[PDB]
Design an enzyme around this catalytic site. Sequence first.
Site, PDB file in Angstrom:
ATOM      1  N   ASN C 375       0.832  -1.191   0.000  1.00 35.43           N
ATOM      2  CA  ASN C 375       0.000   0.000   0.000  1.00 35.43           C
ATOM      3  C   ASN C 375       0.874   1.251   0.000  1.00 35.43           C
ATOM      4  O   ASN C 375       2.096   1.190  -0.162  1.00 35.43           O
ATOM      5  CB  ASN C 375      -0.952  -0.022   1.196  1.00 35.43           C
ATOM      6  CG  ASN C 375      -0.232   0.113   2.518  1.00 35.43           C
ATOM      7  OD1 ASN C 375       0.765  -0.560   2.767  1.00 35.43           O
ATOM      8  ND2 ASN C 375      -0.733   0.992   3.373  1.00 35.43           N
ATOM      9  N   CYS C 377       1.633   3.067   2.452  1.00 35.50           N
ATOM     10  CA  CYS C 377       2.472   3.105   3.641  1.00 35.50           C
ATOM     11  C   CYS C 377       3.375   1.885   3.767  1.00 35.50           C
ATOM     12  O   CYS C 377       4.182   1.825   4.698  1.00 35.50           O
ATOM     13  CB  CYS C 377       1.602   3.240   4.895  1.00 35.50           C
ATOM     14  SG  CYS C 377       0.598   4.743   4.945  1.00 35.50           S
ATOM     15  N   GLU C 379       2.915  -1.284   4.582  1.00 33.10           N
ATOM     16  CA  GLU C 379       2.738  -2.293   5.616  1.00 33.10           C
ATOM     17  C   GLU C 379       1.571  -3.239   5.361  1.00 33.10           C
ATOM     18  O   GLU C 379       1.429  -4.225   6.091  1.00 33.10           O
ATOM     19  CB  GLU C 379       2.573  -1.631   6.995  1.00 33.10           C
ATOM     20  CG  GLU C 379       1.152  -1.574   7.528  1.00 33.10           C
ATOM     21  CD  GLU C 379       0.297  -0.541   6.826  1.00 33.10           C
ATOM     22  OE1 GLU C 379      -0.931  -0.530   7.053  1.00 33.10           O
ATOM     23  OE2 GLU C 379       0.853   0.271   6.059  1.00 33.10           O
TER      24      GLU C 379
END
Lengths: 287, 287, 683, 683
Positions: C375, C377, C379
């Site tokens: 994604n 981010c 994670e």
Amino acid sequence: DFTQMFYNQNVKQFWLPEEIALNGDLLTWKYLGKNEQDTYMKVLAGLTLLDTEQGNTGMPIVAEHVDGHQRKAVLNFMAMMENAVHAKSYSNIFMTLAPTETINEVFEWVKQNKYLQKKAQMIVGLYKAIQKDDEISLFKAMVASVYLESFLFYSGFYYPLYFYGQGKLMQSGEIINLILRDEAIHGVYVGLLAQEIYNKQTEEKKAELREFAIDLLNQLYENELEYTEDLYDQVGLSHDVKKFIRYNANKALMNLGFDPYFEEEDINPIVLNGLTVEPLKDDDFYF
Amino acid sequence: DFTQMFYNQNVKQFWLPEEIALNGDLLTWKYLGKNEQDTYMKVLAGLTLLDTEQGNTGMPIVAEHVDGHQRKAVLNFMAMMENAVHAKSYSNIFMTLAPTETINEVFEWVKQNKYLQKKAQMIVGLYKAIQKDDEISLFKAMVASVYLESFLFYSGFYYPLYFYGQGKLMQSGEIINLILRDEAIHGVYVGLLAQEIYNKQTEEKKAELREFAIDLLNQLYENELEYTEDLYDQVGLSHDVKKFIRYNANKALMNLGFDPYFEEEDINPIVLNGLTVEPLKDDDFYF
Amino acid sequence: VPKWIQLNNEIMIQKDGKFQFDKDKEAVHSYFVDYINQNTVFFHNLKEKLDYLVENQYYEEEFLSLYSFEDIKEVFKTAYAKKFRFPSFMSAFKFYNDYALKTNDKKKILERYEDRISIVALFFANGDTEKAKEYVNLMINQEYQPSTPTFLNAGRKRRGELVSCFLLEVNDSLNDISRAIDISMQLSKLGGGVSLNLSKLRAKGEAIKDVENATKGVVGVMKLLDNAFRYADQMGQRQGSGAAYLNIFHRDINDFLDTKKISADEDVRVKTLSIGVVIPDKFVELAREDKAAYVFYPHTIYKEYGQHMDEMDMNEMYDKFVDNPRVKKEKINPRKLLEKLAMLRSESGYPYIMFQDNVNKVHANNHISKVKFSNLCSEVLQASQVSSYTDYDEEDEIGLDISCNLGSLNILNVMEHKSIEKTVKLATDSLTHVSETTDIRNAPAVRRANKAMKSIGLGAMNLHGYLAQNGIAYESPEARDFANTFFMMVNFYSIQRSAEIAKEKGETFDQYEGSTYATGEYFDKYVSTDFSPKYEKIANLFEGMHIPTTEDWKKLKAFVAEHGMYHSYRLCIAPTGSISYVQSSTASVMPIMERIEERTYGNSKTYYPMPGLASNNWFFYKEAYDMDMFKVVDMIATIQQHIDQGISFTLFLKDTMTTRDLNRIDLYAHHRGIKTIYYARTK
Amino acid sequence: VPKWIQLNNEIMIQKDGKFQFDKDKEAVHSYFVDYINQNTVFFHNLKEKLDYLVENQYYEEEFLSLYSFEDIKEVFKTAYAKKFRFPSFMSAFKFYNDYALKTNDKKKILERYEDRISIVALFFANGDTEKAKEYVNLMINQEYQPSTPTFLNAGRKRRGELVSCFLLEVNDSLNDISRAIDISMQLSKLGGGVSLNLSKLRAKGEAIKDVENATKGVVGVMKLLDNAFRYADQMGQRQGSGAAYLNIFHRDINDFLDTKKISADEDVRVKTLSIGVVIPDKFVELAREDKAAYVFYPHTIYKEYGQHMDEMDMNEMYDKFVDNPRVKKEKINPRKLLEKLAMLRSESGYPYIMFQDNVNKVHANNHISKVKFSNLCSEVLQASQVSSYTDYDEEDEIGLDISCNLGSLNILNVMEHKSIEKTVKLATDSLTHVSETTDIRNAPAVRRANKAMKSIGLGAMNLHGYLAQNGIAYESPEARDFANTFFMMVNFYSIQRSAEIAKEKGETFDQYEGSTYATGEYFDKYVSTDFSPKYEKIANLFEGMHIPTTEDWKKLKAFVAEHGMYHSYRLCIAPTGSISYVQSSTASVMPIMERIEERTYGNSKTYYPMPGLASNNWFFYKEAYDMDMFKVVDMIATIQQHIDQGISFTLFLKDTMTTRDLNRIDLYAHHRGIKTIYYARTK
Ligand SMILES: Nc1ncnc2c1ncn2[C@@H]1O[C@H](COP(=O)(O)OP(=O)(O)OP(=O)(O)O)[C@@H](O)[C@H]1O
Ligand SMILES: Cc1cn([C@H]2C[C@H](O)[C@@H](COP(=O)(O)OP(=O)(O)OP(=O)(O)O)O2)c(=O)[nH]c1=O
Ligand SMILES: Cc1cn([C@H]2C[C@H](O)[C@@H](COP(=O)(O)OP(=O)(O)OP(=O)(O)O)O2)c(=O)[nH]c1=O
Ligand SMILES: [Mg+2]
Ligand SMILES: [Mg+2]
Ligand SMILES: [Mn+2]
Ligand SMILES: [Mn+2]
Ligand SMILES: [Mn+2]
Ligand SMILES: [Mn+2]
């Protein structure tokens, strides 16, 4: 012993007029009398002419005749500053403060002004008289160049400095101070090259070269007096400017290794206030 | 129509050697073979030697004979870049990669090299043949200058760009890319000055100047092919370098307002990776 | 200059040679007494305030109507019974400038911290007053922090989506690309970050309808996505954020990376799109042996095999692709590509690195699909199935698009309260409620995958803060021992809660039977290895808490086999950017970047010391840039062995570190099991 | 250099002070004998050629299966019996470089002019051998030229759509914007030009869901569309071309116009999107009186009145909008906006000008809708209805988009053959067949509107060529008299053919009963006025041809009232650029730009004299830049009074002309009933 440090100083002083926003001078300009604006325009136009010829002719021709790639690089850089930076900055000032017709008129005025034509004739004549492999003709042109850098500009510089020192026209004044900072180092550098040639001569030849330098200075000086009166009488400053040009004439002589010629005088204190990537090895994939 | 625009583009491209740290190149230099190091040294010396001619003679001689204050200023700026920036940059690259004795030997070799000398002296010959107030001889020199800026340098630029596109010698490759970007604009500008002269000529004189340009290009091109094999066969690159020479020859011709001479070819992808208002008057609405 | 700002700025004014850390309590007290108490809308009683908020289109009446007003009053009294006080100025400032409900003119404060917590608890409980009180205690104790979307929007009529992380699979067709652009704009409009997988798109120079050299590659689609994310800027306050992921074996990989070069041409530059690269073990093996590698044209592989290149095992299919004449490939230097990645990460911090084999060797849902990308981010690591968006009037083949709603345990507060199990279970219940209440009307695959997978992300924060406030170095072995034990316990209790939810609701997640949870292969290491602390100092921190043993894990394995698991994914450690200030906790499990955080808000600058920072623990609050990134990798790998999803892992690099140092850090992370690398931050 | 090219270049070599025009016939003969015959594939018979073309996926076998091979042979013999010879090198070069079918490697020629004509005729006839022979005679005589899409793609398996001009209404919503982007990409993938109406989008700074200042305006959608068109650039063979239209009263008009300023920032600048402006008579009236004008925010108007601003009558609703406090508006200077339009057109040729009230005062289908915008060529003027695209899983409200398939009458050839009626009717039949066989499965509004309205565009070309070859000045009153008579006859016979088709099929176009054809108001000027030539010289040009009288128009009116009309729109004069060389005709109805056209093809420069150019007609081949644009406007207005759609009207300006002259030309065109102005070309 000196070219490298002049090279470094010249390149670290590099600037463009566009770095200085000029619209801040609009009001202090509007507020000057018609006489003051006239003298100011004409003064900068006289400076523009000098830098035009110093950039087009003086610095390139001296560069051509001086030996050594580093000396040539310094002289080429100085030439660029004259016409690509200095001469152009004056147009930036003109285009901000003055309407096109006043700009057109002042450039027409330089063409017909007898003192400005005389000083250009004399200086450029000496530049164009340089003969290949003839160090004496080169010395004479370098004296002329020092007199342009360290003496002749100053009848012009007086007025922007005079205003700067009163807190007037300070953006234009900032440009002028940058130009002046450049010319000071240009005059020293060319002075050192001239001294090199002078120091090669017999005592008899040296005596003649001093005569040349002093005769030329006096001839330029007498013309500059008339130019100064012509420009400054209408603003009441001619006597003050005359003291300033004598002061700077002494600095030009000193740049040439000669004793001061004029007696010291008190300069207007206003003008004094105006002054990394590395590759991955096989062991990097194991732990 | 163009000098102020080129002035702007030139001065905004200003840079200095000190800006790029060179020492990190030693981390890829050490991994090249002897032939690669030899070719690089020889190419670099070739570029250095040609660029010195352009700084000492090519740009200053054109600035001398071209009329126009603004053109002289731009040309002065370009001469400054050759002498003050490019020359120091080439020296810096050399001093980083080779010891003093190796530099002296490479320059001795390249100074005696038949193909480098042939092109260097052909160009210099045309600069020396310019006559005062003769625009034909000036045009011929401008053609020579454009051929150097936009064509002759590129057999040399190929190699640093080839490494640069592979992630090798990135610091010196960045420097070379900045130099090349300056030479490109120099070539375009001098090209426009040549077209100005060309367009002032009769039809017969134009045809004669075209024949001159093509004949000169042919002589230089045939020598470039030999120069190329002499340097690049040992590293197996000559075929691709030849395509790059022709592609840049076509750019040089286009700078002079001429048609391309060579068929279009694709270039090595590694080298590519390296590379009148008036107001309505209330009656216009009625008919 | 406000008085509270003056007091806060006194932090850096050293007195007696030491920072005046006590000025922050004074700063927050003055901030409250002079700004917040003054600018707080006054209501006679809770009834009047709630009626005003509901009437004026502030609070949704759907969730409030499930409780009798006595229950709501009791929950609000429970929230206020703690007498919660913000310990530092920055926490209260962040809350009352970002999350506190303000009038439509943004001039007054309608919500206090207790009011926001009570509203969130009532939203979570879904009518359960005792559950709501438990949520109020959990959040007021600051043991659990709902993610910024859930925390800010819960119970609000104007609220956006409570989920903010979206992953979209893009199929290799114009219809699918247009649908992807539309869905990205729709999800950005909701304020959620959108990540797209571009590995299925054919490379530049591929044929469209037997017309060669027609495809524009992934960079044209990236330009489209960048423009779409720029247009859907979410009012412009937070610019639209999107990430594109490409497999390293994709042909367009070099062009994909060139979009982030500063020297790149503006017609190729992608300003608003983050880029991540998916690196299979095959690429690392090729670079390690210095062998020449090939990047393949995806459409040739798809035509030859009828399956996408990123749907196949590259470690098994690379040699077949190379030896297959019908597959088009061009040669590359794997080590040169790694060096280019390191250089790009140093210059811009991009791309994100996903180690596909590290992710998929422990993935529990490989039967559904392998994890092909991450994604925005870095994670979120879940199985995805691409959708087949056909022509108008043709039925679409809706696949599975990844999404998860986030929550963070406060490690310091969870350990102080000795409530790992209860906090984890309550957080799992709240995340499940948020997942069940989400319905995306313009992302068919997102909505279908939310219904089928029930994926949640339960992160953690304040690891470094907790360790420093306990005399433990972040890089020390004891820190890794504590992280191992704590996150093993978190995984155990989240699995237990998921199994209990599956038993109570009678349903598991779709395709649970083929997962490693069902076969028991997931619990092998937990039933064979003991994860109790190996240091007496660490073992003492867990005193008063039951640490699951191999017998407990065997019992949990049997329980899961009996009842299944409600969530396909449970744990992911997101960055937790701005909500950490409210919790007065360090960000995520990363080490702190600065001991004292200097920031300028408006025209006044503010100083934020790390929570609990003092002279005694000053040395334990070592900054990340001063840390050995190998020890940070070791700690993250220790944590990652108990997280089923990924962990946002930022690399903190000194300016003196060469690209070789970054490459070595990435190689060590891949060697140690690190799934993703988020950012390369340079000091 | 090719021998034929050397022969052609001898055109410019003056001999006896005269151009060597006869060198072009030698140039074309050499071109054929030395290149075309050599590179033309050899087939023993027509049966073998047809088999090779069908099997090798060159031709669509379905349309050829409707004829016995005897009929196909007869049609091909009919095409070949004419022994057609290209009169100039450029005609044959253009045909054999653009439209002649070539092998998959583009090395050999599989189709001659006769082969392409026969295939097109067989495709048109749809199984009718006599009709196919009639089409072959029409095309080989060059009386009718099907548009470039139809001519190039008819009967080809690997072909784009035969319709190449589409107009899309965009509704004010994210779903509608995303669908518009998708539809534009789908249509550009088919090679057609797409024009989008952006007047229903709210202006910059409007509220999105009761949050103010959230909208990016039409410029953000313009950037989205520009990137979408750049991406779907027809596999690189032809850059995607799109047009955006904005009503002058839209608030974003100044930002919309600024996207075409050269000094515009790259962020706002749109590079590949053409822009047109829709100017109601209200704006011209305001500018004429120098009164301060207002530009309105469309969403405020929609909320206040429930209708879109461009769906309402501006001439009536302008004062109400100005006096409504709930309608947001921005004060503007109408004359300053007019001068800005003039300067922008002088600098770049944009925007296109659509005079809305000129279009709609004669619009026959105002009951269906007003005409709100034009196409990418500014000659399509049809009623459109905006579609409502809703969320996924909801039902979309499909409206009416615009698309017409084009064909051009060769005026010189039609007049020489005295076949206005037959040519017009055959062209109408072929255009109806093209419309019937067209089905776009990714543009629901386009497909629905094509099925419902049955719109066709029958254009004309070689007006200046025909006039110059007959000793008539383009700017003379005699030229306007001829244009009046010829286009009156064309309109009469197209209406008669439409009525005959409606009677044969027993079906009119959707909502015909409300049209001016049904009520008879369309025929008022034709039944009350005579359009026979007023000059004996022009009247002689029509000798042997029946010129419809007032009695004929009354009979046609009665026939239409009895049977109705099949086509909502029939006539539109498109620019018709590429195929003008093949037809050896002047482009469209515009005057010639240059007597001899100098082109560069490779490294060889080709010389193209204007068709029929000679010493005796040199003066009549006056260049457009030397003509009075007022006289060109008079000509176009004379023609436009018989065209139901628009005429693609390019303005040819000298560099000395100021912006005031351009504004005066625009105002005179608006005064003279001009509907659209295409381009401002400067010399
Ligand atoms: N640091 C803080 N964090 C949160 N709220 C605070 C903080 N400081 C003050 N407040 C709010 O401001 C009110 C007034 O603060 P103050 O310290 O003056 O209270 P008090 O009269 O001493 O008693 P109490 O602490 O019980 O409120 C507090 O009741 C609380 O509502
Ligand atoms: C239409 C189009 C597609 N593409 C790319 C995007 C898609 O990933 C890819 C496939 O396009 P598709 O839309 O799938 O085209 P197609 O299915 O009709 O042709 P084919 O079966 O041969 O694939 O081509 C472009 O780059 N430019 C374009 O104009
Ligand atoms: C979502 C979004 C919309 N818009 C513009 C484009 C649309 O024409 C306009 C309306 O968007 P809509 O999609 O209609 O949003 P909405 O229907 O939920 O809001 P409303 O009730 O006010 O209609 O807003 C943006 O400029 N940026 C954005 O991010
Ligand atoms: Mg496809
Ligand atoms: Mg809406
Ligand atoms: Mn100077
Ligand atoms: Mn100087
Ligand atoms: Mn150089
Ligand atoms: Mn140069």
